[PDB]
Amino acid sequence: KVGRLIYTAGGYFRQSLSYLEAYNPSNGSWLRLADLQVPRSGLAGCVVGGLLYAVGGRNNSPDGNTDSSALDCYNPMTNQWSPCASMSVPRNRIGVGVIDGHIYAVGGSHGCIHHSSVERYEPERDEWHLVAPMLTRRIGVGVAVLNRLLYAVGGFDGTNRLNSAECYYPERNEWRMITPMNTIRSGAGVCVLHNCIYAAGGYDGQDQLNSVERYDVETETWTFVAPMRHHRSALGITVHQGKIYVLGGYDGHTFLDSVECYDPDSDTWSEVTRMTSGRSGVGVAVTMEPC
Ligand SMILES: O=C(N[C@@H](C(=O)O)c1ccccc1)c1cccc2c1-c1ccccc1C2=O
């Protein structure tokens, strides 16, 4: 269990960013690692087999905006990125979850197109294949996996921001609606901790949110927990050693550098570090330290 870092890839501040930086909770240090080959915001990060994957996003740049169909792999042992097979379609503001060593890419946008489509990547074969689409088109969607079931939470369908959520049952290749959240959330951070799916922050159509709610997969209810110190949309999120970490985002005024940590035992958030610069739209995942 030792030696793991929180990696943050990409993001946005004025333009999309290529940064890969890794935080060590055991000593408070940050490392700057190999830049992404292409800057991207609105991507997602995940880890399979000790390798960090960066999925989708968009390169917002002075010379144009290009939505990304890319899958790229970072190996901490070599500090190098390698391209993988690309997805069927570009997906900005994507959500991603991993089940049994397979990466699911969910929703996202391509220009004015808001996807309901979903595809699954097989690292051993370096292939993507489409699976059943969601019941709702969702961009800015939060995704997490609990008990080998995949959840898609909130987002924007092209007309309205959403409080709805749905679950994918892989052995039936089928999506079903679950109880909706109490709050509309686009661009929330969504993760799994213990028996619950958490949705932290986001934008409700009027304001960035500091509230946080969790869905108990047995009781099918959403319950609010302690709010974050900062309102934030387009935040990064991950879980490490039993605590939720939220990174960056936009608070309605500033691109945040703060990283907050949620302790479920005390139901409290604390500010634990700051990124090297404020940014939104990052991808985040946990794997072994490099070299
Ligand atoms: O929170 C906002 N927007 C969310 C939405 O539209 O649902 C969203 C959700 C997910 C990804 C991107 C955006 C929002 C509202 C007004 C002004 C601004 C933003 C914003 C967000 C991120 C970076 C910069 C800004 C910014 O200047």
UniProtKB/Swiss-Prot annotation:
GO terms for biological process: cellular response to interleukin-4; cellular response to oxidative stress; in utero embryonic development; negative regulation of response to oxidative stress; negative regulation of transcription by RNA polymerase II; proteasome-mediated ubiquitin-dependent protein catabolic process; protein ubiquitination; regulation of autophagy. It is found in: Cytoplasm; Nucleus. It comes from Mus musculus. Keywords: Cytoplasm, Kelch repeat, Nucleus, Repeat, S-nitrosylation, Thioether bond, Ubl conjugation, Ubl conjugation pathway. The record marks 112 as: Sensor for electrophilic agents. This is Kelch-like ECH-associated protein 1. The keyword DNA-binding does not apply. Substrate-specific adapter of a BCR (BTB-CUL3-RBX1) E3 ubiquitin ligase complex that regulates the response to oxidative stress by targeting NFE2L2/NRF2 for ubiquitination. KEAP1 acts as a key sensor of oxidative and electrophilic stress: in normal conditions, the BCR(KEAP1) complex mediates ubiquitination and degradation of NFE2L2/NRF2, a transcription factor regulating expression of many cytoprotective genes. Belongs to the KEAP1 family. The modification S-cGMP-cysteine is found at residue 112. Changing residue 161 to A: Does not affect interaction with SQSTM1/p62. Abolished interaction with SQSTM1/p62. The lineage of its organism: Eukaryota, Metazoa, Chordata, Craniata, Vertebrata. Kelch repeats lie at residues 5-50, 51-101, 102-148, 149-195, 197-242, 243-289. GO terms for cellular component: actin filament; centriolar satellite; Cul3-RING ubiquitin ligase complex; cytoplasm; cytosol; endoplasmic reticulum; inclusion body; midbody. Its main location: cytoplasm. Non-enzymatic covalent modifications of reactive cysteines by electrophile metabolites inactivate the BCR(KEAP1) complex. Accumulation of fumarate promotes the formation of cysteine S-succination (S-(2-succinyl)cysteine), leading to inactivate the BCR(KEAP1) complex and promote NFE2L2/NRF2 nuclear accumulation and activation. Nitric oxide-dependent 8-Nitro-cGMP formation promotes cysteine guanylation (S-cGMP-cysteine), leading to NFE2L2/NRF2 nuclear accumulation and activation. Degraded via a proteasomal-independent process during selective autophagy: interaction with phosphorylated SQSTM1/p62 sequesters KEAP1 in inclusion bodies, leading to its degradation. Component of the BCR(KEAP1) E3 ubiquitin ligase complex, at least composed of 2 molecules of CUL3, 2 molecules of KEAP1, and RBX1. Interacts with NFE2L2/NRF2; the interaction is direct. Forms a ternary complex with NFE2L2/NRF2 and PGAM5. Interacts with (phosphorylated) SQSTM1/p62; the interaction is direct and inactivates the BCR(KEAP1) complex by sequestering it in inclusion bodies, promoting its degradation. Interacts with NFE2L1. Interacts with BPTF and PTMA. Interacts with MAP1LC3B. Interacts indirectly with ENC1. Interacts with SESN1 and SESN2. Interacts with HSP90AA1 and HSP90AB1. The chain holds residues 323 to 613 of 624 of the full protein. Disruption phenotype: Early postnatal lethality caused by abnormal cornification. Mice survive until weaning and probably die from malnutrition resulting from hyperkeratosis in the esophagus and forestomach that cause gastric obstruction. Defects are caused by constitutive activation Nfe2l2/Nrf2, leading to constitutive expression of phase 2 detoxifying enzymes. Mice lacking both Nfe2l2/Nrf2 and Keap1 reverse the hyperkeratosis phenotype and are healthy and viable in normal conditions.
